[model samples]
Target: LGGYMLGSAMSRPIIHFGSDYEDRYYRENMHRYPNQVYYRPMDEYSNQNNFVHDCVNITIKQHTVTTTTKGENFTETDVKMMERVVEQMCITQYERESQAYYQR
Candidate 1:
């Protein structure tokens, strides 16, 4: 909940979610469910593609670190929304990577 995400607009998705309360809450909730309950296949597939793109490293260090902890009650919806945003970021990086390789 209280952390910073550092990365480029045309590179990999790197998100750091942290907050004393939020961390413990999510861990407890995860314990209540199976190990794979929160696992999203979409994320896995997107990551797989991005891993392949790792064959070409794009050196863009324009990282924007925004402190995004508004003290809102953490919920599944929040996690899902963040995941959706991360997925979009992954797509953006993937497209950029594709374009770079295609030009070569």
Candidate 2:
């Protein structure tokens, strides 16, 4: 059930520009910018509830579907469920990356 839901929700839309300008633009800037050699991925930030909440919002972008009698308002329940999934996603990915780093 959750797998199917995630299949729908996990899509990352790409930003389209006229060409590959955006990609090269970021690549050049990332190289030329301040010498902060180490940077963190979004997974690290997800430890904060604010990032998890962003995941919640991105997962549950609603559009007036909660008509009064369309069953109980499940927003809070869904929010909690999504938070768990997001946290699990972050924790599991971080663990795997660390495990790989250790092996290397």
Candidate 3:
């Protein structure tokens, strides 16, 4: 996971899994687990330094064997893991987003 803040003022977390399998698995199953995922829209400044911090917060207690056995562990350590994962994810996303804007 990787993320970037605005030079220093803002810090964003982005997550990146190496393969499509991981990415798809995360996309599909993340919500079912105790993890939050979000994408803040970059504003219209061209450089669009203006960004809102979008987040998904999950509680640790949300993850229990019962929840998983029931078929969905919507509240699992996944959210905790996402705290780091999302950061890394955002770093990659930020790079890509910036590239699009900057035409790098």
Question: How many pairs collide in each candidate, listed in order?
Answer: 0, 0, 17
After superposition on all C-alphas, the RMSD of every candidate to the true structure, in Å, is 13.9, 15.7, 11.2
- What count of clashes does model 2 give? 0
lDDT string for model 1 (1-104, tens) is 12212235332223335556644444545432211101112333445455423312121111111112323343454444344334546455555645665588
Residue pairs with colliding backbones in model 1 are none
CA lDDT of each candidate?
0.36, 0.37, 0.43
List ranges where model 1 is wrong by over 4 Å.
Answer: 1-6, 10-73
User: What does the lDDT read for residue 94 in candidate 2?
Assistant: 44
Model 3: per-residue lDDT, tens digit, 25-69? 666755543332344446643332223223222212223343557
lDDT of 1 at 101: 56
Residue-wise C-alpha lDDT for candidate 2, range 1-104, written one tens digit per residue: 12212322221222233457753543344332211111134433334445444444433332113322454344553344434444445344444445765697
| Model 1, CA-based lDDT | 0.36
Off by over 4 Å in 3: 1-37, 44-71, 74-76
Off by over 4 Å in 2: 1-74
Give the TM-scores of the predictions, in the order they appear.
0.33, 0.30, 0.37
